[PDB]
Amino acid sequence: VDICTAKPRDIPMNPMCIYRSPEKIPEATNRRVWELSKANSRFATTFYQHLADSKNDNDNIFLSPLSISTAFAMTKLGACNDTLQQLMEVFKFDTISEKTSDQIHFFFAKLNCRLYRKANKASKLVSANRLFGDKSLTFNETYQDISELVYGAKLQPLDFKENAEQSRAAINKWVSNKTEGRITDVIPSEAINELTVLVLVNTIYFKGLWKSKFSPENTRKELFYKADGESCSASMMYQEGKFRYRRVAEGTQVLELPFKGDDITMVLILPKPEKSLAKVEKELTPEVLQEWLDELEEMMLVVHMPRFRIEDGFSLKEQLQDMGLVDLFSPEKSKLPGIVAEGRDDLYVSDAFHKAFLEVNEEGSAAAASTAVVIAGRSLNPNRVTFKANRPFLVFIREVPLNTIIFMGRVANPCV
Ligand SMILES: *[C@@H]1O[C@H](CO)[C@@H](O[C@@H]2O[C@H](CO)[C@@H](O)[C@H](O)[C@H]2NC(C)=O)[C@H](O)[C@H]1NC(C)=O
Ligand SMILES: *[C@@H]1O[C@H](CO)[C@@H](O)[C@H](O)[C@H]1NC(C)=O
Numbered sequence: 001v002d003i004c005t006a007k008p009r010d011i012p013m014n015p016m017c018i019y020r021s022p023e024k025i026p027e028a029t030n031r032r033v034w035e036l037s038k039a040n041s042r043f044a045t046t047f048y049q050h051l052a053d054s055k056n057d058n059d060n061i062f063l064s065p066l067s068i069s070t071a072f073a074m075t076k077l078g079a080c081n082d083t084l085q086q087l088m089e090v091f092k093f094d095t096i097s098e099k100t101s102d103q104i105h106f107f108f109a110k111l112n113c114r115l116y117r118k119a120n121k122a123s124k125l126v127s128a129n130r131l132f133g134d135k136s137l138t139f140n141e142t143y144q145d146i147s148e149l150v151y152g153a154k155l156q157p158l159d160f161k162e163n164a165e166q167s168r169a170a171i172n173k174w175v176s177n178k179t180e181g182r183i184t185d186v187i188p189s190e191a192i193n194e195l196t197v198l199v200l201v202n203t204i205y206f207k208g209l210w211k212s213k214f215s216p217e218n219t220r221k222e223l224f225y226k227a228d229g230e231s232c233s234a235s236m237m238y239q240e241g242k243f244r245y246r247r248v249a250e251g252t253q254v255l256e257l258p259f260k261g262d263d264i265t266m267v268l269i270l271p272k273p274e275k276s277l278a279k280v281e282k283e284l285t286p287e288v289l290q291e292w293l294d295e296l297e298e299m300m301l302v303v304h305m306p307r308f309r310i311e312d313g314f315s316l317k318e319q320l321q322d323m324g325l326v327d328l329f330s331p332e333k334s335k336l337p338g339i340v341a342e343g344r345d346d347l348y349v350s351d352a353f354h355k356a357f358l359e360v361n362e363e364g365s366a367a368a369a370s371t372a373v374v375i376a377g378r379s380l381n382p383n384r385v386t387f388k389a390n391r392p393f394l395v396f397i398r399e400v401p402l403n404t405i406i407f408m409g410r411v412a413n414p415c416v
């Protein structure tokens with residue numbers, strides 16, 4: 001039995017802990033994963049607006065909401081009561097008609113099967129979801145079992161009591177090994193001591209080549225206009241080609257740059273000069289975003305986009321708590337009956353860390369090169385649209401066939 005042939009009866013969820021959610025289209029798409037994707041995207045824009053709302057406009061942003069949602073879905077396998085309910089609400093899993101928390105894990109089996117098991121060497125996604133617990137903790141057999149089968153995640157025991165530092169180092173090495181070395185410190189200096197009990201860790205790694213590359217020879221220093229009025233020198237890339245596009249409400253330009261493989265694409269949201277990216281951020285709702293993607297059409301245009309490298313690390317407890325996820329991080333309120341410790345009073349999640357890495361260049365989301373481009377016998381319409389991103393713009397990396405937002409971000413300053 002594997003994640004791709006799993007049936008609900010293969011993902012048994014011990015009762016006494018089940019959440020009954022309240023009551024409230026495209027062909028070849030699984031209604032199950034389709035509902036789950038809308039729920040995950042609801043958490044995605046919500047978490048994003050909350051984050052950007054507490055940040056300074058001139059700072060970049062990059063996270064993997066899919067990763068966060070998944071890690072926490074896996075963790076909730078051993079949750080119960082209010083803790084279980086809080087997870088269902090904060091992560092929007094309850095916005096799915098009337099599903100039980102136990103069904104959500106079935107929808108993830110379906111979702112995760114396509115994301116990591118259906119592929120190509122080109123556009124593979126690397127999943128890193130792990131719950132680190134001190135050696136004194138024993139995970140329920142059903143808990144380990146299902147976390148393995150559905151999330152390919154291990155509930156890994158580490159000697160936090162007397163070997164805190166060497167464990168943190170082991171955690172950092174495991175992640176680094178999963179991110180091909182790009183992410184080497186998911187766990188910041190001095191965040192794991194002899195008092196650490198449970199640490200949730202998750203990231204998603206993606207490296208892909210543009211289906212339509214830019215040529216380094218056409219890249220050149222150009223001025224980028226930051227939210228603070230000042231401007232800086234950026235490595236602006238350039239090319240002309242056919243891209244799905246659409247100018248939407250109040251002059252916001254939406255552009256989709258696909259990666260080799262077609263399944264995964266980069267979507268860029270760029271407001272008009274007159275409008276602030278901040279305003280577009282407050283207005284971007286799951287439905288507005290979806291409507292925009294539906295308006296896109298192939299088109300020949302000029303594209304000016306800067307190269308950029310974003311590396312964002314997160315300590316999730318603070319924001320998640322401020323969003324309604326309380327019990328999980330509370331020693332008195334936490335109800336994780338999937339985790340047990342010899343006469344140990346209270347079992348709770350000490351903290352959860354997530355790091356994301358985005359590097360964009362002429363080749364795509366991967367290692368740079370010298371690939372030049374030669375285009376012969378081409379004569380394009382003199383009145384074709386131009387897309388010049390020399391001002392802050394949003395960024396989405398999505399798995400189109402699964403309506404999943406893998407990553408989301410903001411380039412408010414690409415300069416060096
Ligand atoms: C994992 O949880 C199950 C509960 O679903 C524990 O097993 C139960 O144990 C009680 C009393 O010992 C029985 O009344 C139930 O019938 C058992 N359920 C089943 C079907 O196993 C189990 O002990 C837990 N494992 C750990 C490591 O704590
Ligand atoms: C969880 O909720 C159930 C009822 O839904 C209750 O009986 C139980 O005491 C609560 N706490 C735990 C940890 O089971």
Ligand SMILES: *[C@@H]1O[C@H](CO)[C@@H](O)[C@H](O)[C@H]1NC(C)=O
Binds near residue numbers: 126179
């Ligand atoms: C993790 O490290 C092992 C070395 O034991 C290596 O073989 C494996 O390829 C690494 N995992 C990934 C994501 O490549």
